[PDB]
Design a binder for this molecule. Structure first.
Ligand SMILES: COc1cccc(C(=O)O)c1OCCc1cc(-c2ccc3c(c2)[C@H](N)CO3)cc(C(C)C)c1
Length: 236
């Protein structure tokens, strides 16, 4: 996250850190808890991943340095990538992880609701992007989970900033005209969470953009509400 600030324990309890364990253990992507055995994340995170065997999902983490050799994690039973996925910029950047066991909910780990059925006309004015990703180009994964508040932009305006890409209604964009705050590499797969009537909803999945926090280059997110039928079918 560029231009963000440190989160605190329990602030974003649906946020997980997905690690790969080969050839080294590192944070690969973010994700969101949406059910007791289900993480919603981005398909592009799994580039070059040979099988779910090398993945670990850690929940209830604030600092990456908290993760030691005895820290509990969930194994991944299955990775479900959208069948239309090709590359992040072309859409369908969505995947589910089915965990090997259930998540017990606590103040540090709980699910986030999807955008509600019937809420098409809701205008989201309080959206936040969170993650352990880069804070600038050529950075490293950050220790403390970062947060930044970002305004949504219209798909019409987003298309004007990305004339070389097809910005579809299965995507949503968020950014400032002068940049400064944005998601970046390593934040991918995590949530764009918006609070409405004091309830947080998972509105976007961090997906792609041109650089990070550049002027007039908003971040592009998978528009979760357009995938509710797909999510419900895979998790039912
Ligand atoms: C094989 O590559 C990867 C494999 C698995 C995971 C990832 C990942 O995305 O973490 C990955 O990197 C994809 C390439 C990339 C993405 C992004 C970026 C990611 C999210 C994002 C943006 C930009 C927009 N500002 C809004 O939200 C940035 C870079 C450079 C410029 C630092 C590079």
């Amino acid at each position: 996250i560029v231009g963000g600030t440190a989160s605190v324990r329990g602030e974003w309890p649906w946020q997980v850190t997905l690690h790969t364990t080969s050839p080294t253990q590192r944070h690969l992507c973010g994700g969101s808890i949406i059910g007791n055995q289900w993480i919603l994340t981005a398909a592009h995170c799994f580039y070059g991943v040979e099988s779910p065997k090398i993945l670990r999902v850690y929940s209830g983490i604030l600092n990456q340095s908290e993760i030691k050799e005895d820290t509990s994690f969930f194994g991944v039973q299955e990775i479900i990538i959208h069948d239309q996925y090709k590359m992040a910029e072309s859409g369908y950047d969505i995947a589910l992880l089915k965990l090997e066991t259930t998540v017990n909910y606590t103040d540090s780990q709980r699910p986030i609701s999807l955008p509600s059925k019937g809420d098409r006309n809701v205008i989201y004015t309080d959206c936040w992007v969170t993650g352990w990703g880069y804070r600038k180009l050529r950075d490293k994964i950050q220790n403390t989970l970062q947060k930044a508040k970002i305004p949504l932009v219209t798909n019409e305006e987003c298309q004007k900033r990305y004339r070389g890409h097809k910005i579809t209604h299965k995507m949503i964009c968020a950014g400032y005209r002068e940049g400064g705050k944005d998601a970046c590499k390593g934040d991918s797969g995590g949530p764009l969470s918006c609070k409405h009537n004091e309830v947080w909803h998972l509105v976007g999945i961090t997906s792609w953009g041109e650089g990070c926090a550049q002027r007039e280059r908003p971040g592009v997110y998978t528009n979760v509400v357009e995938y509710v039928d797909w999510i419900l079918e895979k998790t039912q």
